[PDB]
Ligand binder design. Structure first.
Ligand SMILES: O=P(O)(O)O[C@@H]1[C@H](O)[C@H](O)[C@@H](OP(=O)(O)O)[C@H](OP(=O)(O)O)[C@H]1O
Ligand SMILES: O=P(O)(O)O[C@@H]1[C@H](O)[C@H](O)[C@@H](OP(=O)(O)O)[C@H](OP(=O)(O)O)[C@H]1O
Lengths: 399, 587, 347, 89, 49
């Protein structure tokens, strides 16, 4: 604090001490979970936050390459000052204006301030969201801003309807700079080209990561049975492009999971009827691809190998999508479901075979069982032919 | 040297990274660019009408901004907001009229209004510039908003805040909201060659204010440089026209069968009057003593006199007006007030300065080969005839703006047609095409855009001028091209119902609505559209609103029905009903 | 002297002076016991009139000069607020001696220009903040005590102090009446509010500030001071339009849940309008008010107010009393407007 | 930089003559107002004054002398203000 | 005073000859940098000496 009050000298001797002090403070600030709470309370009592914030306000030159590292530690300290401490988040939320500056390091601290704090996320003022959206539009396309936008939507499990609606209203306004999508043939080819270099894994901060985060945010903001955001987001990403990008042979699990989540929360789980989903032969190709993925996962496990991303994709989003499609008020009508019956039997047999495998952990076995149950109810109403062995195996668990 | 005043017409010449005049690409396009190769201070650009701005006082947009916000996201509240916006607009108009002529001082707030497009220059901090990312976009908005406010700050230390601005002084234009001075960047537009983007970003650019017209001289009761006028021969009751006869441009008098000669108004008959001045960038009100030049608005050529091939001299069009031959002088046909300003709608006699010969109209036609020649020759003769006088009839600025908008729309529509023919169209290009189609629908309908559905618009009385503009400027041809090219692989009529093709369906419906609106109460447009009856028939049976257009075209038109229905049309109807067995075709 | 370094000490001294001027307060049985014990230990040996005597005593000590100098030379918001509060307390009750001391200090002091400049800058900052926001900002909040202080400065119909506030004998003259009028005009939404949307802008949060501003305007106008009435009526901001709209229009949102505040606001607006033409034989003010104030709307408002007596329930102002005040205003306006006079006649 | 501003002993020479050009509008060629910006032009050479950034004392550690010269062209930026000095000073 | 350069015209002996130049001042306000060497006298050319 004394040095910060007189920062003109260093803004050589007054740099090493600063970096050492910051490194020590960051190192001893957090240990385990209870020592972390004790240190947080102790630092709050002696007002370390005011000192740390004051050091951030020092007028500095655009390019130093030495003092910048100091700010690379200061912010980190503030990140550990609020971990699981809503009081600390409220304390530094009063001075939030200091963090409304272009940059990437400040974005992480801003995200951590609003992390798992419903009282703040639900009361976030419009200027913060506008600032972040305009930074995304003008400054550039970065994943930190998308992460901040995402964390504020869902806090403590509950979804913030106001933020969900406003983020949609302001994101769709800017196009080709913020909401970048690859729907055209040339754009699809470019997307495939960039993806092909990520077969071994999606590089962090790459444009593919930005696209995945954007799709995830778009799906999440409509995860409230909303009628305004759901219809608004349907035009930007049509079902045709979703199916085309999900059914491609050279497709990684991340984009497939993102698209399946989008078509589950924005298309299937909806408050109003969508013509394309039911009165079109689009979701059935997705179901065929789901069966193919199930068979591929079974074969991979049989080969004493496994891909955790593929396991998560096949056990989290596909099952939820299948359950939602076959467990909706508009699906029991089966105006077009009568024409297609073989796909239902294929899905049922694939799901029951997946259950038959012993490696299925108990936590996610309930979703598979629920999918089988829903398919059984659909089959009973639809009067679809059932194989003898499959029928007996299903009836073993029906009652 | 004179002080800058509110209402003066001036042109800005950037002299920073790139030196040149600031202009706009077109009326339909909101981008503003600088073209260094177009011209300089010594030699102003040929299309100087596109580089003229007017200084206007500060305006209030708070109530309008609230109304727009309400529209973006109760009925009584919306009506109250609309009324408040109307009162705010009236108050702004009254204040602007009141502050007319006041001197502009450094550090004050001014607005720049583009004369050709009647749109305020605006800076949007939220949206970055297209070519330059770190900079802020600059565009043109017809209504305007708080982004149009600018500070005319000094560029020379010898000038200080609070001092009167003097014509010819270099200044800095700092937007009030964005806060970053305008900059003529070096980024070059891909579509347009030689044009550099203008964007809001920190720089050292200096804007030189060149005065084109004073606030006092800006009145509609006097002839002024840059004015658009028509030359009417009272004795022959014909309008001067310039057109390509076989392969060369010729100037003639056209023959009209209309009962009223004055009613025979055409775009080719428009001319622009340029007052000869020592300063190339200065116009102003003209004088009887002062010399004049006439420029063809459509082609850009200048009227001149050349040796007669065989009536000693011939009136013709030349590419460059810098030549002394283009000079002309006016002689009053009646008494004048001490050689005062030339009054509007005043009969005059044109004489060639170089040859000292007076214009005259000859009865020898130029198109004898044609069945009904309509082009009459002109020439300069030494003698002066009082009967041979040309009246200069003024054209309203609104008509010129409408013509420019029609030309720009036709150009962009032809570009879109070429893109569709190539087989690939970008999403942004398709959105621009749809927006232009909606704008054209509103243009022909002559109904203000108040959020009403474009596909559902009814007109109490059609505007004949707008329909004639649409037919003459080839907008209908481009509309037919758009209706033909996609269907003729890229898109299929049967697949139009697909959601992926929904924008295409909207575009086709907009085109058909434009066709329906254009032909209402107009024989020539009705025949021109009916010439594509086969194409219109081929598209029947799909949700493209073609049936409504066909019904409107063939409704209560006996002569049109007789002429434009043949055996092939009935055969097509029979084939369609056979293919579908649809009773609607029997109806 | 100590404000330059010991700012906290200056604030404490000002608060102690304010407490001394304030009336006695009860602090409970334990508090009373402690107070009595301490008074006996230390002070072993020993009504508006008492407050006025204490105010005169402090003025003799130089409290008015102290507050004026602090306001002029203070760069800290807390010190300025404390000085304004102390000045309000000194002027509490409209004491003539305190007003005369204030006037003499302003005239003789060479920094009167600086004092009024500080007041005017605070007022402009408050109006700018109100325009920007349209809770309460610090400027809009500090404006309330300033308005209260000015009202007490011009209380009891003091011609000299009202004239001094309107104009000063200095190189730079700051008009506080027009600043208050502009503040009220901006609070109400300006032309948008005056066009029938005033209800949206007015809320229970700013209703108190609006009422205080209206009361200050009435205090300025009454006496009657023809100059203040002319300036308010003919001001370019057209705040008289807002004043007329207040009476003519009903604030739908605030009135829906709270009607007593509406009644007080309308009563204050009617009193202000009556004060605008207390002794004005000339008719230009009447014509200006009639331009905004339509005859038929005025008589309809009066008739509604008379039949609105049922709203008096849980109200400190009778709707019929406000109707009677508006009726007197309409009677005064009638002579100029024939239609208003004809309408006011009974069946 | 065709010519250099210098000091000469005798002012009777025609070279010392200079003329003033207003930097702003003037009242019918009336008296030159006090504290008025002007541009100096050499009558004999018909050249306008201008300030160059080339110093005259490069040898010094911190040069402070900047050179001047007359050029044929006229620059509106290059203007010298004549600031009056009180008689008491 | 040169407004563009914010410098005062001065005349001084550099090495052995008088030279006219613009001086550089480190003061915050250029106008405040007043020196005796910067004083000039204006003589109006008249027919009568
Ligand atoms: O009276 P109608 O049947 O409407 O026909 C009009 C007129 O009689 C001429 O045919 C033509 O003028 P010109 O021969 O002089 O071109 C005009 O075209 P326009 O609309 O292009 O003026 C027509 O609209
Ligand atoms: O701020 P300080 O410490 O008083 O120093 C003054 C100023 O900063 C310069 O050193 C000098 O001006 P120049 O370099 O332009 O000569 C001036 O001399 P002066 O008093 O002779 O103007 C000093 O008085």
């Amino acid at each position: 604090r004394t040095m910060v009050e007189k920062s003109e000298l260093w803004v050589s001797e007054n740099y090493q001490i600063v970096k050492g002090i910051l490194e020590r403070l960051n190192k001893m600030c957090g240990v385990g979970e209870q020592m972390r709470k004790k240190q947080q309370r102790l630092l709050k009592n002696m007002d370390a936050h005011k000192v740390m914030l004051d050091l951030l306000q020092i007028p500095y030159d655009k390019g130093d390459a030495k003092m910048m590292e100091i700010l690379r530690y200061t912010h980190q300290f503030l990140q550990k000052f609020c971990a699981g401490n809503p009081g600390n988040q409220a304390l530094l939320h009063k001075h939030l204006h200091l963090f409304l500056t272009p940059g990437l390091l400040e974005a992480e601290t801003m995200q951590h301030i609003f992390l798992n704090n419903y009282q703040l996320c639900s009361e976030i003022s419009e200027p913060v969201l506008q600032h972040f959206v305009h930074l995304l539009a003008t400054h550039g396309r970065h994943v930190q801003y998308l992460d901040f936008l995402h964390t504020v939507i869902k806090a403590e499990g509950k979804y913030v309807k106001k933020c969900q609606d406003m983020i949609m209203t302001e994101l769709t306004n800017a196009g080709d700079d913020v909401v970048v999508f690859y729907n055209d043939k040339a754009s699809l080819a470019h997307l495939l080209d960039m993806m092909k270099a990520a077969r071994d894994g999606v590089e962090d901060h790459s444009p593919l990561m930005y696209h995945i985060s954007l799709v995830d945010l778009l799906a999440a903001c409509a995860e409230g049975k909303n009628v305004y955001t759901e219809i608004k987001c349907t035009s930007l990403l049509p079902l045709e492009d979703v199916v085309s990008v999900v059914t491609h042979e050279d497709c990684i699990t991340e984009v497939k999971m993102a698209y399946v989540n989008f078509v589950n929360h924005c298309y299937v789980d909806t408050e109003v009827e969508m013509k394309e989903i039911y009165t079109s032969n689009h979701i059935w190709t997705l179901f065929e691809n789901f069966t193919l993925d199930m068979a591929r996962v079974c074969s991979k496990r049989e080969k004493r190998v496994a891909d955790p991303t593929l396991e998560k994709y096949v056990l989290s989003v596909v099952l939820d999508t299948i359950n939602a499609f076959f467990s909706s008020p508009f699906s029991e009508n089966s105006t077009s479901l009568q024409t297609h019956q073989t796909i239902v039997v294929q899905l049922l047999q694939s799901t029951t075979r997946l259950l038959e495998c012993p490696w299925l952990q108990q936590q996610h076995k309930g979703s598979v069982e629920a999918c089988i149950r829903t398919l059984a109810m659909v089959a009973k109403g639809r009067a679809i032919l059932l194989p003898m062995d499959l029928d007996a195996h299903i009836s073993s668990m029906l009652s | 040297s004179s002080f800058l005043h509110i209402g003066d017409i001036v042109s800005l010449y950037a002299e920073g990274s790139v030196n040149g005049f600031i202009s706009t690409l077109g009326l339909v396009d909101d981008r503003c660019v600088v073209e260094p190769a177009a011209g300089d201070l010594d030699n102003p650009p040929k299309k100087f009408r596109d580089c003229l701005f007017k200084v206007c006082p500060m305006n209030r947009y708070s109530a309008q901004k609230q109304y727009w916000k309400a529209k973006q996201t109760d009925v009584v509240l919306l009506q109250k907001l609309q009324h408040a916006a109307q009162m705010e607009q009236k108050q702004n108009d009254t204040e602007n009229k009141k502050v007319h002529g006041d001197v502009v001082k450094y550090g004050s707030v001014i607005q720049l209004l583009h004369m050709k497009s009647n749109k305020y220059l605006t800076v949007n901090k939220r949206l970055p510039a297209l070519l330059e990312k770190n900079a802020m976009r600059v565009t043109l908005d017809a209504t305007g908003n708080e982004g149009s406010w600018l500070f005319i700050q000094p560029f020379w230390k010898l000038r200080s805040n609070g001092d009167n601005v003097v014509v010819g002084d270099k200044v800095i234009l700092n937007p009030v909201n964005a806060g970053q001075p305008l900059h003529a960047s070096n980024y070059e537009l891909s579509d347009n060659a030689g044009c550099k983007e203008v964007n809001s970003v920190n720089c050292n650019t200096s804007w030189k204010i060149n005065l084109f017209m004073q606030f006092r001289d800006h009145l509609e009761e006097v002839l002024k440089g840059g004015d658009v006028v028509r030359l009417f021969h009272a004795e022959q009751e014909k309008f001067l026209t310039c057109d390509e006869y076989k392969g060369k441009l010729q100037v003639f008098l056209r023959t009209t069968l209309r009962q009223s000669a004055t009613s025979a108004t055409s775009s080719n008959a428009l001319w622009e009057v340029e007052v000869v001045h020592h300063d190339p960038c200065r116009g102003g009100a003209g004088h009887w003593n002062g010399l004049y030049r006439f420029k063809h608005l459509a082609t850009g050529n200048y009227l001149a006199a050349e040796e007669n091939p065989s009536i000693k001299y011939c009136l013709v069009a030349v590419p460059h007006g810098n030549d002394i031959a283009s000079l002309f002088e006016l002689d009053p046909t009646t008494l004048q007030k001490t050689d005062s300003f030339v009054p509007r709608n005043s009969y005059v006699r044109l004489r060639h300065l170089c040859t000292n010969t007076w214009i005259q109209s000859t009865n020898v036609p130029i198109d004898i080969e044609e069945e009904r020649p309509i082009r009459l020759m002109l020439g300069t003769c030494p003698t002066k005839e009082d009967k041979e006088a040309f009246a200069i009839v003024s054209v309203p600025v609104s008509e010129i703006r409408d013509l420019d908008f029609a030309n720009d729309a036709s150009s962009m529509l032809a570009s879109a047609v070429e893109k569709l023919n190539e087989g690939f169209i970008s999403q942004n290009d398709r959105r621009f095409v749809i927006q232009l189609l909606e704008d054209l629908v509103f243009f022909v309908s002559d109904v203000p855009n108040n959020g009403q559905n474009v596909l559902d618009i009814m007109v109490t009385k059609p505007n004949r001028e707008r329909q004639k503009l649409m037919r003459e400027q080839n907008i209908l041809k481009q509309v037919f091209g758009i209706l033909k090219a996609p269907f003729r692989p890229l898109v299929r009529l049967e697949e139009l119902s697909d959601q992926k093709n929904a924008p295409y369906q909207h575009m086709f419906r907009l085109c058909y609505r434009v066709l329906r609106h254009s032909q209402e109460d107009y024989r020539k447009n009705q025949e021109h559209i009916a010439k594509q009856f086969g194409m219109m028939q081929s598209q029947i049976g799909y949700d493209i609103l073609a049936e409504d257009t066909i019904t409107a075209l063939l409704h209560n038109n006996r002569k049109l029905l007789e002429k434009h229905i043949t055996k092939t049309e009935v055969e097509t109807f029979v084939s369609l009903v056979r293919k579908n067995r649809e009773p609607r075709f029997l109806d | 002297d100590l404000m330059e370094s010991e700012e906290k000490l200056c604030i404490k001294v000002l608060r102690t002076l304010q407490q001394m001027l304030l009336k006695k307060t009860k602090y409970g049985d334990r508090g009373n016991q402690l107070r009595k014990m301490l008074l006996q230990n230390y002070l072993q040996n020993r009504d508006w009139s008492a407050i006025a005597a204490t105010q005169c005593r402090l003025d003799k000590e130089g409290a008015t000069k102290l507050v004026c100098d602090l306001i002029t030379s203070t760069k800290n918001e807390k010190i300025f607020q404390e000085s304004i509060g102390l000045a309000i307390h000194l002027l509490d009750g409209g004491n003539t001696e305190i007003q005369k001391s204030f006037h003499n200090l302003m005239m003789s002091d060479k920094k009167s220009e600086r004092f009024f400049k500080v007041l005017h800058d605070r007022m402009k900052r408050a109006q700018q903040e109100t325009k920007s926001t349209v809770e309460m900002g610090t400027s809009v909040l500090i404006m309330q005590p300033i308005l209260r202080f000015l009202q007490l400065l011009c209380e009891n119909h003091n011609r000299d102090l009202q004239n001094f506030l309107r104009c000063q004998n200095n190189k730079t003259n700051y008009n506080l009446v027009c600043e208050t009028l502009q503040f009220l005009d901006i609070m109400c939404g300006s032309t948008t509010g005056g066009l029938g949307l005033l209800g949206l802008y007015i809320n229970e949060d700013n209703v108190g500030l609006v009422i205080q501003t209206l009361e200050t305007l009435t205090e300025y106008c009454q006496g009657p001071c023809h100059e203040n009435q002319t300036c308010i009526v003919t001001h370019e901001s057209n705040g008289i339009d807002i004043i007329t709209a207040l009476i003519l229009n009903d604030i739908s949102p605030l009135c829906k849940y709270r009607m007593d505040l509406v009644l007080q606001l309308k009563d204050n607006a009617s009193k202000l309008l009556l004060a605008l033409m207390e002794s004005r034989h000339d008719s230009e003010n009447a014509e200006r008010i009639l331009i905004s104030l339509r005859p038929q709307e005025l008589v309809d408002v009066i008739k509604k107010a008379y039949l609105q007596e049922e709203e008096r329930e849980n109200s400190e102002v009778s709707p019929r009393e406000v109707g009677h005040n508006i009726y007197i205003l309409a009677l005064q306006l009638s002579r100029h407007n024939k239609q208003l006079q004809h309408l006011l006649k009974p069946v």
